[PDB]
Ligand binder design. Structure first.
Ligand SMILES: OC[C@H]1O[C@H](O[C@H]2[C@H](O)[C@@H](O)[C@@H](O[C@H]3[C@H](O)[C@@H](O)[C@@H](O[C@H]4[C@H](O)[C@@H](O)[C@@H](O)O[C@@H]4CO)O[C@@H]3CO)O[C@@H]2CO)[C@H](O)[C@@H](O)[C@@H]1O
Ligand SMILES: [Zn+2]
Ligand SMILES: [Zn+2]
Length: 525
């Protein structure tokens, strides 16, 4: 479905000040007459790339900067072009986190970092090292309480300990990041995760402790310490708990390295209100009047606005937030970060629950992260290899030839997908492309429809149906499909896929693997 013009729909995570932002949306409504609707769906960071690719989705997407690069690579975000004076209104390093391929793709909002939150009534002077926490918990068990309870279901909360001794996501030496080099199955990461598992072995922590269980246990004085961010400061105030925000403990003397997140706001590429959403994000809801209103509901930490960050720089809770931030490192915004987080989430959960040893869980995370971040397009492959496209030597999957430079560019032009077999990567040459389309169309042809009849047969609008050229396999754009409708021409259903003629073209066991390889070549979308 298409987005309604004249209305702003904003998606933001549930643990943020969405009520504090909805009140700012009404201030923009009093001056412009445009209602600003906020929504906090579950798994919005995953549902957004599902619906933004079909033109649907909200107008503004709120998340930490690590996810936006994947949205920009998929062509889901609109380029942010602020004024030269507006870029100096915010800190320069916050803009570096929202730049992808030399282009601003989001608005920096606030810098987030984990910190050690403890109950001062139940723990004076928290420990400076993780190693003395088992001894500290044994004393509090006699008092009927526990020492530390934080979220163990999201790797964001456990990564400070894992990265303290050598664990890293993607290694960056001199230029960019190294996708093939992931630092999850190293000696330092195995040490950090082992200490976390032994904490669960000795009944000092519970593997099923999530976000709300660790929050309720700290908002009721049941546990002494809890690791969380600035957004969870308001729930502790309403619970009347004398707490403190201090530095995270160290492991092997080395300080914990939390992954620093810059909350950002991106504009949907299919939004009919790009200028309306830009006016809200820039002038009439980002200044000190807007950031202060959102901070009332859920605190944001060290904001990116200079005129407002100095008014809270002397905050003891925010001062420690920046101390853990400098001892950590900023999250990459590369599209491969989703593969990293998915692999580490499984590793921590499987290790904590005892389903895998720490060694096996981290070894599999290394393999899974690389296997999920592997290039799908020729351009991505050349960038992965840090070589120009014409230096790529890509075997064809369907014959013994290697692709020419033109065939390499045509591979991505026709929206093909790289094939991975036995470690080798494969493409498809021009002759095999046309040869596969002919065999597919002359052996698996199912039905014919005339123009707009495809919408009923496919149960989808013409814009949302994936149609490829029955001759050259290229993906048809919206105008090619509408032209077939206007000219009353034929759409064909072949191998449960829809085919047509692009504006440019005119006219047993070995075959099953052939047609199976063609499925992976064309993909689902
Ligand atoms: O089991 C599948 C799970 O998938 C969903 O969560 C995923 C996300 O899709 C990924 O984006 C990633 O999440 C990262 C996140 O990208 C990163 O910003 C950071 O998130 C912080 C955030 O910065 C901070 O502002 C605050 O909101 O806390 C967040 C962490 O709780 O770290 C995340 C990694 O933990 O990886 C997770 C999966 O690990 C989906 O939301 C899950 O429900 C689902 O189970
Ligand atoms: Zn070939
Ligand atoms: Zn064609």
């Amino acid at each position: 479905m298409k987005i309604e013009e004249g209305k702003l729909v904003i998606w933001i995570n549930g643990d943020k000040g969405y009520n504090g932002l909805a009140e700012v949306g009404k201030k923009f409504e009093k001056d412009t007459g445009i209602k600003v609707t906020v929504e906090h769906p579950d798994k919005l960071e995953e549902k957004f790339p599902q619906v933004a690719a079909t033109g649907d989705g909200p107008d503004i997407i709120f998340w930490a900067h690590d996810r936006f690069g994947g949205y920009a690579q998929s062509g889901l975000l609109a380029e942010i072009t602020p004024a030269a004076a507006f870029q100096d209104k915010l800190y320069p390093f916050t803009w570096d986190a929202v730049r992808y391929n030399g282009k601003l793709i989001a608005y920096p909002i606030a810098v987030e970092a984990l910190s050690l939150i403890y109950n001062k009534d139940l723990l004076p002077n928290p420990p400076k090292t993780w190693e003395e926490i088992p001894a500290l918990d044994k004393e509090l068990k006699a008092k009927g309480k526990s020492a530390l309870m934080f979220n163990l279901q999201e790797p964001y909360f456990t990564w400070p300990l894992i990265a303290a001794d050598g664990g890293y996501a993607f290694k960056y030496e001199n230029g960019k990041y190294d996708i093939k080099d992931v630092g999850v199955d190293n000696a330092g990461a195995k040490a950090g995760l082992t200490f976390l598992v032994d904490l669960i072995k000795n009944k000092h922590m519970n593997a099923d402790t999530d976000y709300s269980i660790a929050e309720a246990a700290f908002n009721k004085g049941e546990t002494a310490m809890t690791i969380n961010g600035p957004w969870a400061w308001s729930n502790i105030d309403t619970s009347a708990v004398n707490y403190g925000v201090t530095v995270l403990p160290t492991f092997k003397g080395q300080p914990s390295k939390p992954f620093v997140g810059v909350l950002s706001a991106g504009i949907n590429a299919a939004s009919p209100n790009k200028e309306l959403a830009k006016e809200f994000l820039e002038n009439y809801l980002l200044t000190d009047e807007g950031l202060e209103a959102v901070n009332k509901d859920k605190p944001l930490g060290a904001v990116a606005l200079k005129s407002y960050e100095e008014e809270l720089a002397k905050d003891p809770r925010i001062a420690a937030t920046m101390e853990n931030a400098q001892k950590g490192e900023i999250m990459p915004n590369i599209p491969q970060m989703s593969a990293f987080w998915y692999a580490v989430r499984t590793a921590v959960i499987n290790a904590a629950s005892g389903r895998q040893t720490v060694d096996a869980a981290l070894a599999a995370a290394q393999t899974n992260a690389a296997a999920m971040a592997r290039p799908v397009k020729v351009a991505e492959l050349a960038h992965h290899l840090n070589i120009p496209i014409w230096e790529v030597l890509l075997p064809c999957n369907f014959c013994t030839g290697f692709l020419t430079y033109q065939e390499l560019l045509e591979f991505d032009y026709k929206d093909f997908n790289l094939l991975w077999k036995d470690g080798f990567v494969f493409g498809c040459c021009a002759a095999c492309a046309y040869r596969s389309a002919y065999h597919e169309f002359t052996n698996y042809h199912q039905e014919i429809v005339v123009g707009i009849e495809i919408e009923g047969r496919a149960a989808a609008n013409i814009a949302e149906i994936v149609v490829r050229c029955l001759i050259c396999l290229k993906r048809l754009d919206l105008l090619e499909k509408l032209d077939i409708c206007a000219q009353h021409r034929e759409f064909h259903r072949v191998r449960n896929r829809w085919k047509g003629v692009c504006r440019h073209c005119r006219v047993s066991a070995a075959a099953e693997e052939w047609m199976s390889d063609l499925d992976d070549l064309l993909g689902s979308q």
